[PDB]
């Protein structure tokens with residue numbers, strides 16, 4: 001009967017496919033239909049809302065492709081008497097300040113970035129690298145707050161553990177995917193021939209994977225590269241390879257919580273005018289590596305299948 005939308009900026013990522021699967025579970029448990037729409041740019045985003053209105057949807061969960069679309073999304077929704085919940089990426093106003101009025105469910109970005117930096121440093125220590133010939137490559141997406149809090153948290157943790165500040169090189173990526181990060185990393189690598197071992201910092205698996213791919217192209221072997229992604233589910237094809245690579249592991253948060261909980265809160269809101277909390281921060285995280293990924297995914301219910 002009741003129809004609710006679930007709009008995601010990147011349907012190609014397992015992260016978002018997983019949110020969609022758990023949204024469907026909430027739909028089965030509470031009695032609603034989930035309309036799954038891909039919104040990779042702003043145009044499609046606004047058109048998709050129009051489409052939801054025509055289908056008679058009462059609201060939607062959205063991971064916007066652009067935080068700065070916040071105002072427009074809210075205006076359009078209001079126009080159609082639709083409730084909106086943001087997942088993963090927070091809406092911001094024209095000045096870049098957070099739109100605290102839209103309920104949000106997101107991960108603990110700073111805490112998870114710090115964990116990434118802690119685990120990089122620990123693995124570096126395990127390998128015995130000389131810090132003098134080591135460097136950090138931080139691939140950044142500073143226009144996205146959640147991305148920025150992860151990479152800053154990671155660099156802060158490295159600096160706190162003793163990694164020399166002057167050997168931390170930042171490079172912006174134009175797209176949050178393997179091609180964008182590949183290009184970024186490739187430009188930094190040729191600027192630093194003196195480096196023999198790289199730590200690769202990025203806000204998610206694809207970003208780190210593009211960095212790792214670039215290092216392979218510049219003649220670095222796996223032993224001399226450590227990249228730890230974030231998302232978990234996006235790293236399974238890499239961790240499943242026969243041979244080890246510079247991609248050492250991934251921090252697995254809870255996309256299942258993001259998908260179900262945002263959908264459940266939307267339903268309660270639409271069906272009972274039960275007002276969601278403004279901010280829901282999911283703190284769950286576990287390091288998955290070649291040795292435990294299958295066991296940890298099955299144990300979280302996102303099973304190696």
Ligand SMILES: OC[C@H]1O[C@H](O)[C@H](O)[C@@H](O)[C@H]1O
Nearest residue numbers: 015088089107146176204231
């Ligand atoms: O909330 C986590 C989520 O954050 C952003 O949306 C990223 O683009 C996704 O890949 C995922 O890491």
